[PDB]
């Protein structure tokens, strides 16, 4: 009852064995210590470019679905983002049921006498409200 | 490299007066949902 180690069956430990077989790390443990307290880049280093196709697809789908406003010859949709409008001083914006981001461009002016600073963000904040109103 | 330089104009500053004409036509909607 004190030296029966020679009669003890062999421990298998299938999980730990399969983990240590090829994964030379500590995956079978809590790995949220250095992750939850650090802003590491998980994925989409340069592969995010491939998501632009799906982004443009979703943008076109939402455009087709939602009743578009008057043309104004300024409507456009391409990669990267969706050019909202460019007629006159209209700015462009797009996202990144579904969210809707903004602040990609700004207003334009002429006949200088420099132009107004970035205090326009106020309206942008209201735009944010219009982004969350979803009417 | 530019966080203190505030370029003042004060010529077209009238725009701020026009600023108090959008919330009156339509106000923003409070969310209280920081998703």
């Amino acid at each position: 009852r004190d030296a029966l180690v020679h009669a003890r069956l062999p421990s298998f430990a299938i999980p730990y064995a399969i983990d240590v077989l090829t994964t030379g790390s500590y995956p079978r443990l809590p790995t949220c210590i250095r992750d939850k307290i650090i802003p590491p880049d998980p994925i989409t280093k340069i592969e995010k470019q491939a998501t632009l196709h799906q982004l443009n697809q979703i943008l076109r789908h939402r455009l087709v679905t939602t009743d578009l406003p008057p043309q104004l010859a300024n409507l456009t949709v391409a990669n990267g983002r969706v050019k909202f409008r460019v007629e006159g001083e209209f700015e462009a914006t797009l996202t990144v049921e579904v969210p809707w981001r903004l602040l990609k461009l700004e207003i334009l002016v002429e006949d200088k006498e420099l132009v107004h600073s970035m205090q326009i963000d106020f309206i942008h904040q209201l735009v944010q409200s219009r982004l969350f109103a979803d009417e | 490299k530019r966080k203190e330089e505030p370029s003042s104009i004060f010529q077209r500053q009238r725009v701020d007066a026009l600023l108090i004409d959008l919330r009156q036509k339509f106000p923003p909607r409070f969310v209280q949902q920081k998703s």
Binding site: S117, Q119 | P6, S8, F10, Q13, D16, L19, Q32, K34
Partner: peptide, 19 residues
């Protein structure tokens, strides 16, 4: 919960052009 007030003062574009 970002803000529960009405703000227009924060801009406060200074003059600093006394002649």
């Amino acid at each position: 919960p970002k803000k529960k007030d009405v703000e227009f003062l924060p801009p406060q574009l200074p003059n600093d052009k006394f002649k």
